Amino acid sequence: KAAPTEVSSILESKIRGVSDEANLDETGRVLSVGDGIARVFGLNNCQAEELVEFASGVKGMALNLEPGQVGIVLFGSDREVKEGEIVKRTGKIVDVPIGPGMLGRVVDALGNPIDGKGPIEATGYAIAQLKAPGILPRRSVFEPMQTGLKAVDALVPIGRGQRELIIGDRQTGKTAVALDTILNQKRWNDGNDESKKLYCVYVAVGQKRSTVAQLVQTLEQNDAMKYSIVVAATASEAAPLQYLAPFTACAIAEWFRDNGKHALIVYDDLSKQAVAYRQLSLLLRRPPGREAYPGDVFYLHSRLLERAAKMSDANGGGSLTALPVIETQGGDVSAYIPTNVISITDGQIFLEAELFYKGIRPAINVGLSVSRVGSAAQVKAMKQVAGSLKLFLAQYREVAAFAQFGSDLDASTKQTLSRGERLTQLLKQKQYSPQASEEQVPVIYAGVNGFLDNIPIERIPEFEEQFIAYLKANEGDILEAIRTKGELSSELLDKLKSATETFVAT
Amino acid sequence: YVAVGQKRSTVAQLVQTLEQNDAMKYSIVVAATASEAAPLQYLAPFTACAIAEWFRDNGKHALIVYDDLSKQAVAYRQLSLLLRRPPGREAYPGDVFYLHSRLLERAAKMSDANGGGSLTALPVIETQGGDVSAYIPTNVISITDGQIFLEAELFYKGIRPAINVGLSVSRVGSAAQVKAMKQVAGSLKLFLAQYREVAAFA
Amino acid sequence: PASGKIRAVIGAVVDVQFEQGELPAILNALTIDQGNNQKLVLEVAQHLGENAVRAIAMDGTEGLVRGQTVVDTGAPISVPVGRGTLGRIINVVGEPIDERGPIECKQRNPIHADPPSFVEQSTEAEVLETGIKVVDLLAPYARGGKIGLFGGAGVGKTVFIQELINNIAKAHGGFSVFTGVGERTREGNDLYREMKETGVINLEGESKVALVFGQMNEPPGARARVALTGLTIAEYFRDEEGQDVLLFVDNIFRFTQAGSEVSALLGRIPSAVGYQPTLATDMGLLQERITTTRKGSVTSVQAVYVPADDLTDPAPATTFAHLDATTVLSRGISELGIYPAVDPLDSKSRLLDVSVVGQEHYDVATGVQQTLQAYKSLQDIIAILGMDELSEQDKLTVERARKIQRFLSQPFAVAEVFTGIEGKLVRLKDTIASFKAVLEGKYDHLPENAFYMVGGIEDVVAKAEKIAA
Amino acid sequence: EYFRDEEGQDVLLFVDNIFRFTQAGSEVSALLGRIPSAVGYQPTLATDMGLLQERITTTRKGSVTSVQAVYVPADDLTDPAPATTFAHLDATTVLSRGISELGIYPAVDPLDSKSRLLD
Amino acid sequence: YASEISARRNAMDNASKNAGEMINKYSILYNRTRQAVITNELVDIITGASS
Ligand SMILES: Nc1ncnc2c1ncn2[C@@H]1O[C@H](COP(=O)(O)OP(=O)(O)OP(=O)(O)O)[C@@H](O)[C@H]1O
Numbered sequence A: 001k002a003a004p005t006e007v008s009s010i011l012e013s014k015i016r017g018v019s020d021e022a023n024l025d026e027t028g029r030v031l032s033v034g035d036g037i038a039r040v041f042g043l044n045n046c047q048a049e050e051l052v053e054f055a056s057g058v059k060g061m062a063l064n065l066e067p068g069q070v071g072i073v074l075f076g077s078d079r080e081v082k083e084g085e086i087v088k089r090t091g092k093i094v095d096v097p098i099g100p101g102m103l104g105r106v107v108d109a110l111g112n113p114i115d116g117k118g119p120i121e122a123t124g125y126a127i128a129q130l131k132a133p134g135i136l137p138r139r140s141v142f143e144p145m146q147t148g149l150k151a152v153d154a155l156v157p158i159g160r161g162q163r164e165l166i167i168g169d170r171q172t173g174k175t176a177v178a179l180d181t182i183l184n185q186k187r188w189n190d191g192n193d194e195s196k197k198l199y200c201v202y203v204a205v206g207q208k209r210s211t212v213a214q215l216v217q218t219l220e221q222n223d224a225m226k227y228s229i230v231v232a233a234t235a236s237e238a239a240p241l242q243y244l245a246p247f248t249a250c251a252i253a254e255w256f257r258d259n260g261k262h263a264l265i266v267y268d269d270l271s272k273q274a275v276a277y278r279q280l281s282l283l284l285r286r287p288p289g290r291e292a293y294p295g296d297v298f299y300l301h302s303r304l305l306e307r308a309a310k311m312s313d314a315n316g317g318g319s320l321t322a323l324p325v326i327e328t329q330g331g332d333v334s335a336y337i338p339t340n341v342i343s344i345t346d347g348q349i350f351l352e353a354e355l356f357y358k359g360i361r362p363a364i365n366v367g368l369s370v371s372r373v374g375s376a377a378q379v380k381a382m383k384q385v386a387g388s389l390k391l392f393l394a395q396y397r398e399v400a401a402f403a404q405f406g407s408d409l410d411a412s413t414k415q416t417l418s419r420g421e422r423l424t425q426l427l428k429q430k431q432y433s434p435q436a437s438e439e440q441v442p443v444i445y446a447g448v449n450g451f452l453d454n455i456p457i458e459r460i461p462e463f464e465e466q467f468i469a470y471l472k473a474n475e476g477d478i479l480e481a482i483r484t485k486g487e488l489s490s491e492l493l494d495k496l497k498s499a500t501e502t503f504v505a506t
Numbered sequence B: 001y002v003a004v005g006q007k008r009s010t011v012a013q014l015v016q017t018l019e020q021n022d023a024m025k026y027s028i029v030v031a032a033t034a035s036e037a038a039p040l041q042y043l044a045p046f047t048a049c050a051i052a053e054w055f056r057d058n059g060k061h062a063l064i065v066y067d068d069l070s071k072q073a074v075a076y077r078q079l080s081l082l083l084r085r086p087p088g089r090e091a092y093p094g095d096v097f098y099l100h101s102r103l104l105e106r107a108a109k110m111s112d113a114n115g116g117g118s119l120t121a122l123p124v125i126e127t128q129g130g131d132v133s134a135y136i137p138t139n140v141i142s143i144t145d146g147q148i149f150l151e152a153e154l155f156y157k158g159i160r161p162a163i164n165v166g167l168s169v170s171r172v173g174s175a176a177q178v179k180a181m182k183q184v185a186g187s188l189k190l191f192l193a194q195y196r197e198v199a200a201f202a
Numbered sequence C: 001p002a003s004g005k006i007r008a009v010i011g012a013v014v015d016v017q018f019e020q021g022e023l024p025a026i027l028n029a030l031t032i033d034q035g036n037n038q039k040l041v042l043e044v045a046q047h048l049g050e051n052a053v054r055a056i057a058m059d060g061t062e063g064l065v066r067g068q069t070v071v072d073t074g075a076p077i078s079v080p081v082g083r084g085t086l087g088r089i090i091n092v093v094g095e096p097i098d099e100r101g102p103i104e105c106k107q108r109n110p111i112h113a114d115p116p117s118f119v120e121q122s123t124e125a126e127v128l129e130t131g132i133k134v135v136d137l138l139a140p141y142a143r144g145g146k147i148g149l150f151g152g153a154g155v156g157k158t159v160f161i162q163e164l165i166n167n168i169a170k171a172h173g174g175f176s177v178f179t180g181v182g183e184r185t186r187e188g189n190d191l192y193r194e195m196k197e198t199g200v201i202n203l204e205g206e207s208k209v210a211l212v213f214g215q216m217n218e219p220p221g222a223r224a225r226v227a228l229t230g231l232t233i234a235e236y237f238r239d240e241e242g243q244d245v246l247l248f249v250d251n252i253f254r255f256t257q258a259g260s261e262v263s264a265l266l267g268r269i270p271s272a273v274g275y276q277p278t279l280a281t282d283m284g285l286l287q288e289r290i291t292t293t294r295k296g297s298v299t300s301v302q303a304v305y306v307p308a309d310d311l312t313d314p315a316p317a318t319t320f321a322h323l324d325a326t327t328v329l330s331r332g333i334s335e336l337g338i339y340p341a342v343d344p345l346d347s348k349s350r351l352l353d354v355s356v357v358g359q360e361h362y363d364v365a366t367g368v369q370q371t372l373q374a375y376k377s378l379q380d381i382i383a384i385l386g387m388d389e390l391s392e393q394d395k396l397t398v399e400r401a402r403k404i405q406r407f408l409s410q411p412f413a414v415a416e417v418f419t420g421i422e423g424k425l426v427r428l429k430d431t432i433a434s435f436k437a438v439l440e441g442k443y444d445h446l447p448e449n450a451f452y453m454v455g456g457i458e459d460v461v462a463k464a465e466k467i468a469a
Numbered sequence D: 001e002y003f004r005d006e007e008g009q010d011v012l013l014f015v016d017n018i019f020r021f022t023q024a025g026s027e028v029s030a031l032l033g034r035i036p037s038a039v040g041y042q043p044t045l046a047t048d049m050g051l052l053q054e055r056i057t058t059t060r061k062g063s064v065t066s067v068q069a070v071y072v073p074a075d076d077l078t079d080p081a082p083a084t085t086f087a088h089l090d091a092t093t094v095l096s097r098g099i100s101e102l103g104i105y106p107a108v109d110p111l112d113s114k115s116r117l118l119d
Numbered sequence E: 001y002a003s004e005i006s007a008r009r010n011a012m013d014n015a016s017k018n019a020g021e022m023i024n025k026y027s028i029l030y031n032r033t034r035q036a037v038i039t040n041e042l043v044d045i046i047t048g049a050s051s
C-alpha cells in the first residue's frame, strides 16, 4: 500500500516547486541510513553496481536502483552517514587495479595498498563483475600444477585452468594444502621460463586481522611473496567489501592469463563469501530462499569460478587456477553451500578430522577426493608410477578391516596389507616441506615395485630421507633426466631398479 | 476415471485400451494433465464428483477413481502459496485436510427414499518410499473406510498385485461382499498375515 | 515499435514502464541496447499494474541506468530452427556462440509454445530401437518419452550419448539436440571437441546434432530458459520434417533448480525443501512437449541427479513421474570388463511389457533378468563355499550367466579408439534371437570369452571358431 | 452443562474428535489478520483450547465425565494440537501406530499412557 | 570347535543382513527429516520478514 522515497520531508518539496535543484542525476540526498545500507533519494543517471561517495568520505555501491530511491551499500561504518547528507556519484562501475606492479604488496577489496610500501604501478583497470570465457576460447588442461605433496601429485592431480575445491572441517587440512602449493613454485618462478611460472593470488576473506599477518610473514621468509598477490578482506569491515573480494581478486589475476602467463587464485574461504552476500541482500528488502540465502546463491559462486579457465593458443596460451576452500560444518559434504561448490568445480579435495589425528599429514581421503582432468594434466614420468599405485590403494582400503586379525591372514591378504601401509606412510609429508617431481617419482617407484616391503612400518620415515639424500650424490644423472625430459624410457627404468636394490641391503 | 497430474501421453494410451475391450462406452474420463494451470488440476476432483452424483441421485451406481490424490494436493498448494498464506506441515495451508474430506464425503450410499443409488470413491495415494505417516497420507486414511497398501518390495518379486494382508483392510467390506466367496474363503485374511511373518523368520 | 523506460533494476529483476495499450503480455522478450553486447534479452514475467510490468533479464544487468530505452519484440524469445542449427553452438536467445558466423535460418520459432492436444497424441506406446544389446532387450526406450541417465563420473555417460545419436541417424534418420543446461565452463569446451573427432559434428561436412550452450555463469533467466530453447529446435524436426529426434538435457536437476531461483527473487513464497511453489507446473510444461504426434516423435534422454542420494525429494520425485525409461549406469562394471557399464537389473522401463513388445520379447526379457538376479545374489555364497559345492542345476545356470553378462556389452562405433574392436549395431530382431538360443542350450559348449565385445548371433559363432583355431 | 448445573446429573461428554476444533480455527486465522504460529497454526492455541476444556469439568452441582479423542498429526505427539491438550486431561490413552501392526487389539501403549488415579 | 565356528558364521551373516535393513529404514527417515528441517527453517524466516 505505502511506499518510501517521498515521505513527510521528501514529500514537502514538490508542492511548492517542481524544480529546486537542477541535478537529481549525479547527486542524491540520504534519507535513511542503517545496517550498512543507505537509501539515497535521487541519482537517476547512476548505473547499476556503480561507485558512490558520501559527504563524510565513505564510499558506496548502488545495487538496488528503485524508482524513487536508490539502495547503496556503504563500504565503511554507518556512524559517518546521517539523514540529509549529500551522496555524489563517481560515474564508473566497481573496478579494481591490475597489472604486474601489484606483486609484492597486500591490497584490499578496492585496490588500495595496506602493506605500507607506497603506491602500486597499475597498468590497467578491470571491472569486478566481468564475463567468463566462452566455449571457443578454451582448450584442454594439459599443463601440470606442481603442488609439492606426494598424495596430491599422484591421486587427484590438478592442472592449469581447472577448479579444485578444498573441502574440509575445522582444522583438518584446508588452508595447509593451498599454502604448500604456492610455496612450491619457487623452482619455476626464480628461473627464466615464463610459461612454467605461476603467480599466486591468496584472497583472505572472512579471516581475522591476526590470521592475515601470520600468513604474509611466513611467505616472505621463504622468498614466496615477491610474485603472490594478497587480497586482504577481514571480517571487521562492511558486508560489501567481503562479498566483492572474490570478484576483485579474480580481475587482478586475469591480467596474467590474458598476456601469456599463468595464475592461481586461492579463495579462502568459499563459506565466508556466501555469508557476506546474504547479509547485504537481507537488508535491501529482498526475499530469501534456502538456508537464509538469496535467489542467486548458485549463480554467485558459479560466475566467479568459471572465469579461471585455460585459454587456447590464439588467445595467448595462459591459464588460471581457482582453489576455493569450502569450510564444512561437521563433515557433511552434502549441505547447502557445500553441494553448490562441488558441482560447479572439476574436482574436490576432502579433508577429514579423523585421519589427521592418526598420523596422515595431511588428511586427504583417496576414496572421496578425485580429479575430473585425470592423467591428462600431469607429467609422463609421474604417470607411470601413479597408475599401479591407484589400484593397490583402492584394494587395500576395502580390505583394511582385516588388520585387527593378523593371525588369520592368507598369502594375498598379507601382501596387500604390507604394501598398502608403506604406500600411505610414504606420502605423508611435513608442513612447509614440498617435494619436486624428481624426488616423488623415485619414492613412489620403490613402494609400488616391492622394494619397501622388507622394511618395517616404523622405519618408513627414516627411509624417505636416506634414499633422497643418497640419490643426489651417487646417481645424480637419473634425477636430473626425469625432471628435464619429464618421462621415463627403457634406460631409465633399468638404472632406477639397480640403484634401489643396492641401497635396500643396508 | 479422473486423471489428475498425469502426463499427456499416459492419458491417451489409457483411453485406447478401454475402448478396445468394450469398456469406454459407459465410463467418464476427466483429462487433467500437469501442463495446464494450477486451478484446473485442483478443481478436477470437484468437477468429476458432480457428474457422478447425478446417477446416484436418480437410481444408479457410480465408481469414481481419483488418480491420483497426491497430485491434487500439490496443485492446490501452488495457488495458496502465491496468494500470501500461512504454510503448515510440508508447506501446506490450513485447509489442506478440508479439501480432501469434503470431496470424499459426497461418495456415499443413499437410502430407499432418495433413489437407492450409491457412489464409490477410489483414491490413489502416491507414497514417497512407503512413508504412510506423512501429512497427505494420514489425511486421506482418516476419512476413507479402508485402504489398499501397495508395497514396493513384493511388487518386484513377481507378486502382482502386491497387496499386503497385514496393512490393507476394509471397514464396510464384510457385509458388502458375496456370500459364495466369503464362505469358501474361511479365515483367509488371518491366515495370509500369519504366514508372512512365519516365513520371514524361517 | 513499442518502446519502454526502465524504472527499477534490482539484480536480474528489472521493471519496465510502457504506455497505454502498447503494454506487452507475459513471456515476451524485451530488447535492450548495451555496449559490447548485441541485445539484452528480458523475458516478461508479470504485470504489477499502473503501466508497469516486471521482467527478468537473461544476461548481466550491470551498467543499466534508470530511464534506458527498452524496445519490445512483440513476441516471445525466438530461436533459429531447421537444418542450419546443426553443428553450431546456440544460446538461450538463439544466438551463435561458436564464432562461425550467423545461423542463416528461414524462420524463427518461439520458445514459449503450447504442447500437443489429447486428440493429436499417440494412442499406443511404441518402442525405440537404440542399437545396443542391453537397451533393446532390458529397459526399452519409449517412442516419445523421457529416459533417465543416472551414473557417476567416468562410467560412460558421454560415450553413451554419442553412440545413441549416431545409431539413430543411420537406422532411423533422426537428428539430436544436446541442451547442456547448468553445465560447467570446462565441460562445454570438451564436449564440442570430442564430437568433431568422432564424426557427429562436422564443420565442412554434414552435422547431425545441435549444440545449445547453457553454463551456470549467467543469471537465473538464462539457465531456466535453456531447456525451452533446446526443445524448440528438436520439436521443429518432428512436426515439419517428421523425424524421431532425441533431446538431451544435461543435467535434469539443473532445470528444476534454475526455475526456483527466478521465482524466489520475484516475490513468490517457497515450497518444500526450499523449492518453488509451481514445481509440478514448470516441470510439466516442458516434458509434455516432447511426445509423439501424427508426424513424428521426440525422445528425451536427460540425466537425472538425485539430491544428496535421496529419491523422495521434490526435485527427484517430480521428474520420475514422466520418465518412461531409465538408463542406470552403476560403478560395479566399467573396469570389470563390460562396455559400457549398463546395469541389467537396475535399469527398468515401463515399456517392457507383453502388450507393447509382444509375447516373444517379453519371454526373452524375463528369462535374462531371472538368471542375472540369481547369479548376483549367489555371489556371497560362491566366495565362501567355492564353485564345486553346488547342485547340477546351480552349476549349469552359473556358467550361462557369466557369458550372458558379457554378450550384452557390445563395442560402439565411437569407442573404437579405446577398445580396438569394430562397432557393432545389433537390431531388435537380432538381439532377441541371440538371447533365446543361449538360454535354451544351443551355445552351452561355447567359451565365456567368445561373447565378450560382440553383438548378434552371427558374431558369437565367428569369434568362437577363430579363438582356438 | 445445563444437565449438571440446573439439574445436577452426571453427564457424559463424548467428542470425536477433539483435534478437529483446533484444526478448523487455524484455516480461518490467516484471513482474520492473525500471524501464523508453530507448524502454521494460530497464535491463540492455548487460549482457545483452555476456554472450552475448563467448562467441561466437575463442579459442586454435578459431574461431567469427558471422554474425548485426540488425533495425532501424521503420527507426531510433539505437534501444537496434541501437546497442548495433554495438560487438560486426567487420564490419557495414547495409541501408537507400531503396536497396531503387530496384532494388539487395541494398540494401548503402556509406556505412554498415564493417569492421575494410578496410586 | 568346528560346529561353533560354523554356527558363528551363520550368526554373523544374519547380523550383517539385519543391520542392512535397519540402515535402509533409518536412511528413509533421515531423508524425510532433512527435507522437513529445511522447510521449517525457511518458514520461520519468511514469517518474520513479512510482518
Ligand atoms: N600436514 C600437516 N602436518 C602438520 N601440521 C599441520 C598439517 N596441516 C596443518 N597443520 C596444522 O594445522 C594448523 C592450522 O592449519 P590451517 O591454517 O591450514 O587450517 P586453519 O585455517 O587454521 O583451519 P580453520 O580455518 O578451520 O581454523 C597449523 O597450525 C598447522 O600447524
Ligand SMILES: Nc1ncnc2c1ncn2[C@@H]1O[C@H](COP(=O)(O)OP(=O)(O)O)[C@@H](O)[C@H]1O
Pocket (backbone or CB within 6 Å): C152, C153, C154, C155, C156, C157, C158, C159, C160, C339, C340, C410, C411, C412, C415, C418, C419
Ligand atoms: N564402449 C567402451 N569401451 C571401452 N571404454 C569405454 C567405452 N565407453 C566409455 N569408455 C570409457 O569411459 C570413459 C568415460 O570418460 P568421460 O567421458 O570423461 O566420463 P563420463 O563418461 O562420466 O562423462 C572414457 O575414458 C572411456 O575410455
Ligand SMILES: [Mg+2]
Pocket (backbone or CB within 6 Å): A174, A175, A268
Ligand atoms: Mg584457513
